[PDB]
């Protein structure tokens, strides 16, 4: 097996592969082992863990050596970029599969994490056992963009939740509530709210029994004013309130919160 | 049996009234318009003719209003009747408003307790929900059993603002999370992934408890080592999220606002630090 890209994810992936008995070949620009991107010729599938797909085009003028190779791109980027990368690779005679690794670096050895895969079905199966060294696998289809669609959707919720968490902690600190005291309350049931919200969105109808945008908007005003009074930055909660206001402007006052999705949807 | 009075009959008040009736309390209510109370009167509630009369009924006084300013208006005729009463204000507002409301009430000889009810209306009465309380300790104890009819209780201290601090902190995370969830769903719909398919992944994909604990610990510490995860990478990750949304034609205001915080981190020189260090950009002076 060969691996290019030695950020934290790549180092962790390399270590798991070594510990599992694979004959690993790596190339990196830094000193920190193949002499050139040579690495493609080592014979294994080629794992990429780069910051973006644009890096793949730079790092690789070895395009002739792609013929007959299998590229497993485990770095994240847009679905469009992933589809373009696949087409480029296949144009030089390689097979291509996209991975969306749903774990931080320290989780890479573990049993509790998974990764999405999509692209070349045969190439995925040939390397499934190798990929299971890193995380459990979940192949979604032959469209090389699809694993990235899933990945980016989940990361969207993730980062929005985490920045909200930080803001909540900033309010706690500003109001004299210790981080150790508030943390268990922040941690402890979103599953229930998610399920009901998904159901309502699936339906098409957003009845205002259970919650109403006019009251939700007032609730969010109090959050923002509480942050202001405490002297904490209010950009994030204002952006959240901004969606509610848009709902009100659209005439949604008596509808449930879920109807706001129609303000975010594509045409 | 035991008497209780309630003012404010929006959804939350209506739910609270029903629970109290079902638990055998002698309830008295007052409202600006007579219609919303006839319903509870049919179920055995006394309806008072004025706010003053409602205060006199003899129980603790529960408030479930839209904001604390409303308390000053509806009780305008009735300040003299506050002497010796206990106010349990279960409506949400700012900590500063809650402190002011308590001081005013105490100035007219009442005791005051603040509630932050962590349940939607339909959950009132259930076993799985709780509420924060703060303010007058004795008054909380005297009415604890009554309050446990509505939700489990969690008394935090004598500062009448404190329960609202907790409440607002939690709602801050709650709404930010929920709007993110909606945005995620919009991307799913735009990209042709069915809501039923993506939903279990959104619910189960990342165990947030673990990330929260580690983030809190790091913030408690005071430094933010990038030796496993770093703001330059986190920023790039967020760029891909926003570009994915753009490509799909979905509204991008929310993910931009999230990205904006990472860019501020970069501008401040935080590229090599962990994500938690962004808290110092949000902190009070």
């Amino acid at each position: 097996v060969t691996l290019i890209g030695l950020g934290p994810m790549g180092q962790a992936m390399a270590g798991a592969l070594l510990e599992a008995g694979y004959e690993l070949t790596v190339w990196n620009r830094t000193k920190a082992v193949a002499d050139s991107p040579e690495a493609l010729r080592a014979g294994g599938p080629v794992l990429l863990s780069l910051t973006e797909h644009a890096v793949m085009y730079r790092v690789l003028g070895a395009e002739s050596d792609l013929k007959g190779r299998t590229i497993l791109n485990l770095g994240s980027d847009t679905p469009a970029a992933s589809r373009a990368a696949a087409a480029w690779a296949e144009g030089h005679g390689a097979r291509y599969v996209t991975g969306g690794v749903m774990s931080p670096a320290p989780g890479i050895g573990s049993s509790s994490v998974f990764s999405f895969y999509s692209g070349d079905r045969a190439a995925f199966e040939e390397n499934k056992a190798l990929l299971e060294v890193l995380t459990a696998t979940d192949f979604r289809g032959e469209d090389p963009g699809l694993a990235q669609v899933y990945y980016q959707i989940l990361l969207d919720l993730f980062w929005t939740t985490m920045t909200g968490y930080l803001h909540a902690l900033a309010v706690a600190r500003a109001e004299g509530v210790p981080v150790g005291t508030i943390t268990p309350y922040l941690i402890e049931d979103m599953a229930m709210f998610f399920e009901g919200t998904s159901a309502a969105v699936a339906e098409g109808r957003f009845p205002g029994d259970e919650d109403r945008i006019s009251m939700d908007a007032a609730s969010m005003e109090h959050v923002v004013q509480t942050s202001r009074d405490a002297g904490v930055d209010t950009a994030l909660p204002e952006a959240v309130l901004s969606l509610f206001r848009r709902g009100l402007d659209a005439g949604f006052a008596e509808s449930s919160f879920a109807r706001l999705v129609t303000l975010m949807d594509a045409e």
Side-chain angles (χ1 to χ4, degrees), chain A residues 1-5 7-18 20-22 24-26 32 34 37 39 42-57 59 61-62 65-66 68 70-110 112-127 129-141 143-188 190-204 206-208 211 213-266:
Chain A
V1 53
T2 150
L3 175 72
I4 295 169
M9 275 298 165
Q11 9 260 20
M13 289 174 178
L17 288 170
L18 292 166
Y22 288 80
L24 179 68
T25 307
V26 298
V46 185
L47 266 65
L48 304 172
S49 187
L50 281 17
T51 188
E52 194 167 3
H53 296 358
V55 173
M56 169 185 85
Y57 305 116
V59 45
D65 289 295
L66 287 162
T70 295
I71 308 293
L72 311 173
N73 192 349
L74 306 191
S76 259
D77 198 332
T78 67
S82 299
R83 292 184 188 111
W88 176 84
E90 291 168 8
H92 289 69
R95 311 195 291 327
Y96 189 100
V97 303
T98 344
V101 182
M102 208 52 78
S103 165
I108 285 299
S110 84
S112 45
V113 296
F114 79 106
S115 298
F116 299 100
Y117 290 96
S118 76
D120 196 289
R121 210 279 128 80
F124 168 71
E125 246 110 37
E126 285 175 30
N127 297 283
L130 176 32
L131 294 172
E132 310 229 277
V133 169
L134 312 179
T135 75
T137 66
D138 186 344
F139 186 86
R140 305 302 306 147
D143 170 14
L146 190 61
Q148 269 308 297
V149 169
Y150 278 81
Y151 180 86
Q152 296 301 329
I153 289 169
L154 267 63
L155 265 291
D156 185 14
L157 173 62
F158 178 89
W159 282 126
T160 302
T161 300
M162 290 301 301
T163 56
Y165 188 83
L166 279 181
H167 186 273
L169 289 188
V171 178
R173 306 164 100 213
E175 292 281 1
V177 179
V179 168
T181 307
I182 192 72
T183 291
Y185 292 100
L186 291 169
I187 294 172
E188 259 110 30
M190 300 301 30
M192 200 206 70
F193 291 103
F194 290 163
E195 308 237 65
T197 300
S198 289
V201 170
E203 174 158 31
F206 312 97
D211 95 272
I213 285 168
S214 55
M215 311 184 47
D216 302 330
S219 172
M220 232 356 261
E221 239 123 24
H222 289 151
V223 172
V224 167
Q225 188 67 46
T226 298
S227 308
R228 233 212 136 150
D229 291 353
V232 157
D233 190 276
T234 68
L236 186 62
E238 280 280 15
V240 175
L241 174 58
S242 281
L243 300 159
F244 288 97
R245 295 197 267 246
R246 286 172 57 187
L248 294 176
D249 288 351
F252 298 176
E254 292 313 297
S255 304
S256 73
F257 164 79
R259 188 161 181 199
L260 295 177
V261 75
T262 65
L263 290 174
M264 288 177 315
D265 279 324

